[PDB]
Design a protein around this ligand. Structure first.
Ligand SMILES: *Cc1c(COP(=O)(O)O)cnc(C)c1O
Ligand SMILES: *Cc1c(COP(=O)(O)O)cnc(C)c1O
Ligand SMILES: Cc1c(C(=O)O)sc2ncn(C)c(=O)c12
Ligand SMILES: Cc1c(C(=O)O)sc2ncn(C)c(=O)c12
Ligand SMILES: [Cl-]
Ligand SMILES: [Cl-]
Lengths: 360, 360
């Protein structure tokens, strides 16, 4: 069963918030939210209502056993003032896989997307239009059983909130980051749930990020296995553009073998690069041994993260235990990074019509 | 920094709820709860208040990034109608470790214990006194940042709720369980957070527990490593009583190497067995290979889980690689299980005076 967009009830706010004139991520919210409840009778009617607090029983399984998941995607306003979502169907697919993994109720992906469209329409004037700005969309699905039994919930709650966000690069120019690479830290494991966007994967990273700051780095490079596989960078997927040990110029990102969150940007980068057909594009594990060797031999061109936050984020330094490694990304253009950002911009802000964009 | 039981505020319930007459675990709650708030100004005053809903900001870090941890302990009412907590100091020590792992605010263990005592004192009439019954105490600490950044919270809530519970073994006698042992399912990893009582560790197990029921078993035997180490049973620590390969009779449980939750009952069983001095008590890795051989050689006496839910739970069958292994636990009395159950019962209900009991 599923809630239907046709049954949406609109409750307009009677206390609209003043909109921002420095947009700090995730702190400023729009006037309305989507809310849908689920119980033994199935899904209730979906509603667009004023942004407000959640009321939760103290035994809510959302709070005791982390029956919670979320999504993250962006709406962009072009010069034509039309608002469009970037490949939202993929976020809906990923959200439904997350729900199944936590035994939370299934919903219809197109119905949720239409409800999200309607919510964005209502708050469309919150969508900024300055260069590099967007509206960040945060759907959440939580279990809400008033019981301490660890079990499949008989009640759940689905909601969506929205945040206007400023440019990730406030100088209009990509700025690289430093990463702490310590094999002591583990984000996810084969047989785990690191490949789903579940609240539980993020909580334990807070301390590790504090340690990266203490050691003078900006983000965490998550290592896995005896061979020190480079898996992810903070909450971004990792890409390396290099001449591989067989003399072939290639773009590589780690495969979806369970420890990688399948990013929408990640898939888009692979799609674009495969479409150009100008170099080899692979999904393969990347080890610190291969990286060190490639740096020494001058084979590394660019290393970057991909994610909804920044789209593409250059890396210039990796602190691996005591060894400070310069990554020559910015000394190589960064040609690929700039090319990806340009093409994504064209697609996202409607400069070039595209099947990847969902109009609001 | 900590809140003080000396500054405790009380507010009695306007309309007391009626006590139970068939109690399912975790569904029925008492009249009051403890609540303490934390922010930039530190801990506010703790307060005992009527059982009421939580009001959370939609961006609460508790719901997006699983900034949440909990405890579980029991209070027992003896014939003298006096209520006692079992080794609550250990639960406080554990909770604080959990808090520090999630960068949640430190508190004073004795102050919280006193606040909990006071709360149970207020609801003392909810503590049942029929055989095998108790009050389950559920302290929770959650982050409550009203922003979407993954970061150390600047706001948190600590609360405690209470549940009266019936006997785990309704017939008044230990009944054994069957376990599904499939290496595909991984509860925790070295370097991870399985040794903390965080909500994130439990959500992912719901689906696995459903698979266990699907395949005809009652709980999950969590295996780890290429050597298939027996780590835990459901949410219980695992113990094996056997004649070891060296011909010596021993009680063995896996060591606290990172993938094992340090259970309070677990520690108590080791403490008791060591005090008796009748056989070897050891913390050592247990592999399926060892177990299989021991079973074929008739060397296994008893296999059981330990935890607050049941104290001690016999195991009679493990389904491993499509093959059903019979565990002869009940055929051996189960002597050790019964002995542990009886001594814990005598201590917990005040039949024998003991420093492990904390009077309310
Ligand atoms: C969200 C996320 C990503 C990137 O996903 P996108 O869908 O591209 O924004 C990568 N890794 C982790 C751990 C994430 O949570
Ligand atoms: C709670 C728990 C235990 C047992 O702990 P006790 O303190 O004895 O109740 C064992 N294993 C796991 C995974 C747990 O969550
Ligand atoms: C989505 C997101 C972040 C996150 O996912 O936490 S951090 C962050 N910083 C800047 N900008 C522009 C973002 O969009 C952003
Ligand atoms: C604490 C607990 C459970 C849990 O923590 O899931 S399940 C359960 N079943 C029975 N009894 C008596 C308990 O105390 C109990
Ligand atoms: Cl995947
Ligand atoms: Cl430990």
């Amino acid at each position: 069963s599923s809630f239907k967009a046709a049954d949406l009830q609109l409750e307009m706010t009677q206390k609209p918030h003043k909109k921002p004139g420095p947009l700090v991520f995730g702190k400023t919210f729009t006037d309305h939210m989507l809310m849908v409840e689920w119980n033994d009778k199935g899904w209730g009617q979906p509603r667009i209502q004023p942004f407000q607090n959640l009321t939760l029983h103290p035994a809510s399984s959302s709070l005791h056993y982390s029956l919670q998941l979320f999504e993250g995607m962006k709406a962009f306003k072009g010069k034509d003032q039309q608002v469009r979502l970037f490949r939202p169907w993929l976020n809906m697919d990923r959200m439904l896989r997350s729900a199944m993994r936590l035994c939370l109720p299934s919903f219809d992906k197109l119905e949720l997307l239409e409800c999200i469209r309607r919510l964005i329409e209502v708050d469309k004037d919150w969508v900024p239009d300055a260069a590099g700005t967007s509206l960040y969309v945060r759907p959440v699905l939580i279990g809400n059983e008033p019981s301490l039994g660890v079990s499949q919930p008989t009640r759940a709650l689905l909601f969506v909130i929205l945040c206007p966000v400023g440019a990730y690069f406030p100088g209009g120019s990509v700025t690289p980051v430093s990463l702490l690479a310590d094999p002591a830290f583990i984000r996810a494991w084969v047989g785990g749930v690191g490949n789903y966007k579940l609240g539980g994967n993020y909580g334990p990273t807070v301390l590790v990020q504090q340690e990266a700051l203490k050691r003078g780095c900006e983000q965490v490079l998550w290592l896995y296995g005896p061979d020190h596989q480079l898996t992810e960078v903070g909450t971004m997927n990792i890409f390396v553009y290099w001449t591989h040990e067989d003399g072939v110029l290639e773009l590589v990102t780690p495969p979806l073998n369970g420890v990688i969150l399948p990013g929408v940007v990640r898939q888009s980068l692979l799609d674009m690069a495969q479409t150009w057909g100008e170099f080899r594009v692979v999904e393969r594990t990347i080890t610190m041994k291969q990286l060190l060797r490639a740096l020494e031999e001058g084979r590394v061109r660019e290393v970057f993260g991909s994610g909804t936050a920044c789209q593409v984020c250059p890396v210039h330094r990796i602190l691996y235990k005591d060894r400070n490694l310069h990554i020559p990304t910015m000394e190589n253009g960064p040609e690929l990074i700039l090319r990806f950002q340009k093409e994504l911009k064209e697609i996202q802000y409607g400069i070039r019509a595209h099947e990847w964009m969902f109009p609001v």
